[PDB]
Structure 1
Amino acid sequence: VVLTEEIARAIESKYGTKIDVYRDEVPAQIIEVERSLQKELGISREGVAEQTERLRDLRRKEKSGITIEGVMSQKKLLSMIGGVERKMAPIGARESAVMLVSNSIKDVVRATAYFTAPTGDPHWKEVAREASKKKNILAYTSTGGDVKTEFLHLIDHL
């Protein structure tokens, strides 16, 4: 963990590394940032005061008688975290253009497509016939092998 949320959000901006902040839980390991990496990232002069005052509070805690060590270089910090992100990750309006997939008999009037595969359903013959009676319907079929991967591919792509 790191001594402040400010550094965590700063490295979130720099790469996106989700790093937690110490909240007096356990005698854990703490990272700290000196003048070199502060000048590297460009943190405001306000945050240096907070980090140094936390460091001297830990100094007081040590004198009252917990591990703290510092990172010096960007490459060392990259090896320290052990992960580099994949930059942008946009999120769409919804997961799929299909909102509902069901089996009920009363919904065949409103249904618009159907996939078929050998299944143990007592009403599969009935629902398949009823869906096939429509004048313009979107019917897909299985060709053996793995049905789950095909259906998952179809439901992502449709």
Structure 2
Amino acid sequence: AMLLAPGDVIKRSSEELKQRQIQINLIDWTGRWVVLTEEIARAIESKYGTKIDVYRDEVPAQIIEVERSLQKELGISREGVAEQTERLRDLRRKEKSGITIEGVMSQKKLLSMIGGVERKMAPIGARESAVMLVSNSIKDVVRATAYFTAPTGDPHWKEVAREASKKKNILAYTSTGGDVKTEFLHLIDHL
């Protein structure tokens, strides 16, 4: 299930495409926070799928201080809390021997600050979508099984459309009204 689409559409929907695990092949035409210790970052990455960096005495930076509430929420062990507060004491001593720390302690604050949205409660299928690749290259026009069109234009889209319409058995979809991105996402969901 391989689809061809205008380049601006994939450019605008790259985030959703990455979130739904479809690989992107496109041709162009012309401060973060860190966790005190690696264990908490690993736990939060496992829970939410969000990559988190680790503080390594680099520069005056902004530190995230996970609080007792989220410590209990994430199921963190006693040793993790102990090492977190040990690193906290080390930071206290370092800044007393003359960096900003935030004691985030609500789940919504952490979500609205950084990271990916939590997981829904449905059965997990083998794959999120039935499509593997959406591309905008003439080099793999024979690779495609269907294509999508929009009133928006690309300098190479006309030739690709001509070379794709020549296929004997290919599914063709066109969008005329509403939002192009919403229609494309609905199509990629139902295809």
- For residues 87 and 117 of structure 2, the distance between their equivalents in structure 1, rounded to whole angstroms, comes to 28
Normalised TM-score (structure 2): 0.45
Task: Tell me whether 83-92 or 133-142 shows the greater mean CA deviation.
Answer: 133-142
Change in 2 beyond 3 A, CA 1:152/1:24: same
3-state SS of the aligned residue for 1:130? helix
- Gapped regions of structure 2 (runs ≥ 5): 1-33
Alignment RMSD: 6.3
Change in 2 beyond 3 A, CA 1:65/1:18: same
Q: Which structure is larger by alpha-carbon Rg, 1 or 2?
A: 1
Tell me the alpha carbon deviations over residues 97-136 of structure 1, each in whole angstroms, 9 at most, x when there is no partner: 9999999999999999999999999999999999999999
- For residues 116 and 136 of structure 2, the distance between their equivalents in structure 1, rounded to whole angstroms, comes to 44
Task: Tell me whether 75-84 or 144-153 shows the greater mean CA deviation.
Answer: 144-153
The answer (yes or no) to whether the contact 1:117–1:141 under 8 Å persists in 2 is yes
Percent identical among aligned pairs is: 100
The answer (yes or no) to whether the contact 1:15–1:87 under 8 Å persists in 2 is no
Alpha-carbon distance, 1:60 to partner: 0.3
- For residues 79 and 110 of structure 1, the distance between their equivalents in structure 2, rounded to whole angstroms, comes to 40
Tell me the alpha carbon deviations over residues 47-71 of structure 1, each in whole angstroms, 9 at most, x when there is no partner: 1110001001110011101111111
Change in 2 beyond 3 A, CA 1:3/1:90: farther
Change in 2 beyond 3 A, CA 1:71/1:134: closer
Normalised TM-score (structure 1): 0.54
Alpha-carbon distance, 1:37 to partner: 0.9
Tell me which of 32, 40, 65 is aligned to 1:32: 65
Change in 2 beyond 3 A, CA 1:25/1:127: closer
Number of residue pairs aligned between Structure 1 and Structure 2: 158
Alpha-carbon distance, 1:84 to partner: 2.5
- For residues 102 and 44 of structure 2, the distance between their equivalents in structure 1, rounded to whole angstroms, comes to 18
Higher relative contact order (CA 8 A, sep 6+): 2
- For residues 148 and 185 of structure 2, the distance between their equivalents in structure 1, rounded to whole angstroms, comes to 11
The answer (yes or no) to whether the contact 2:48–2:116 under 8 Å persists in 1 is no
The answer (yes or no) to whether the contact 1:17–1:85 under 8 Å persists in 2 is no
- Gapped regions of structure 1 (runs ≥ 5): none
Alpha-carbon distance, 1:151 to partner: 19
Change in 2 beyond 3 A, CA 1:128/1:22: closer
Change in 2 beyond 3 A, CA 1:11/1:89: farther
3-state SS of the aligned residue for 1:54? helix
Change in 2 beyond 3 A, CA 1:25/1:150: same
